[PDB]
Amino acid sequence: ENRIQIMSTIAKIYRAMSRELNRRLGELNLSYLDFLVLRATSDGPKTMAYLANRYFVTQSAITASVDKLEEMGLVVRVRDREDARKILIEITEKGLETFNKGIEIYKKLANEVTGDLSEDEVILVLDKISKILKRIEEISQ
Amino acid sequence: ENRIQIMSTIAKIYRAMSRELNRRLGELNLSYLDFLVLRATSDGPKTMAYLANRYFVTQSAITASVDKLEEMGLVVRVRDREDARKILIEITEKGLETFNKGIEIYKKLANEVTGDLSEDEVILVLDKISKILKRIEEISQ
Ligand SMILES: [Ca+2]
Ligand SMILES: [Ca+2]
DSSP states (O other): OHHHHHHHHHHHHHHHHHHHHHHHHGGGTOOHHHHHHHHHHTTSOBOHHHHHHHTTOOHHHHHHHHHHHHHTTSEEEEEOSSOSSOEEEEEOHHHHHHHHHHHHHHHHHHHHHTTTSOHHHHHHHHHHHHHHHHHHHHHHO | OHHHHHHHHHHHHHHHHHHHHHHHHGGGTOOHHHHHHHHHHTTSOBOHHHHHHHTTOOHHHHHHHHHHHHHTTSEEEEEOSSOSSOEEEEEOHHHHHHHHHHHHHHHHHHHHHTTTSOHHHHHHHHHHHHHHHHHHHHHHO
C-alpha cells in the first residue's frame, strides 16, 4: 500500500544519501558519522551516551568517531570541575569551521536531490513528514 | 534552510523506524537487516553482492544475516548447475510465511506513524519524495 511505500522510500533515500554524503565528506576527512558528531556538538557540548542514542549507533562507534575527531583537533573532552569520569564532548573552533564546510556539502546535495520540488512543495512535504517523525519518535522510545 | 530539513528529517525518521522495527521484528526472531534480506528475496533469488549493495551494508553483515536465515530455514543457497562458486539466495516457503508476518508488522507501524496524514496527503508526499529518491540514486551511484 501507500503508507508502506512512504516509509520504505524514506529508507531508500536515507541509504543513498548516507552513501553519497560519506563520499563527498571524505574530502573533509570525515565519514557521515563524524559529521553527525560535529553537527550535534556544533550547538553545545554533548555526552557520548546522548550521541550514541540520538543517532542510533553503538557506543564503540561513537568512541571511535570522537577519538578520531579529537586527534583531528575538531572536538575536545571536557571533564567536570569536581568529577573526572563525567565527560562532555565540546566542539572546537576548527571543528566549527570544518562543520560549516560539511553543512555546505550537505546543503549542496540537498538542493540537487530536491531540485524537482518547488518551495511550496518543499514546505508541504517537510510539514507532513515532520508529523511522521513526531509519531515514530514518540513510539520508538 | 528547508531543503536541508527535508533530508535531515528523512534521516531522523529512518533511524527511529529502524530502531522500532528491530524491536517489533525481534518477536519473529529477526533483526531489521534479516527482514530486508527476506523482502529482497521474496520476489526472486538474489546474489549476496546485490543484497549488500542494494541495502548499503557490509558483505560480512550480509553473510551473517544469510547464515542466520539459512539456519532458520527461511532461505537456501542455490548453486549454478555447472558452476559452484556462483550463489543465489532463494527464499523458502517458511521464509515467505515469516516475511509476510514481517510485512504486517511493517504495515502496522507505517499506518501508525503516518496517521496524521490522509490518503491524498500520503499520495502527495509519496509522489514528491519518489522524485528525491530518483535523483539521489542517480547521483549516489
Ligand atoms: Ca513513548
Ligand atoms: Ca550516475
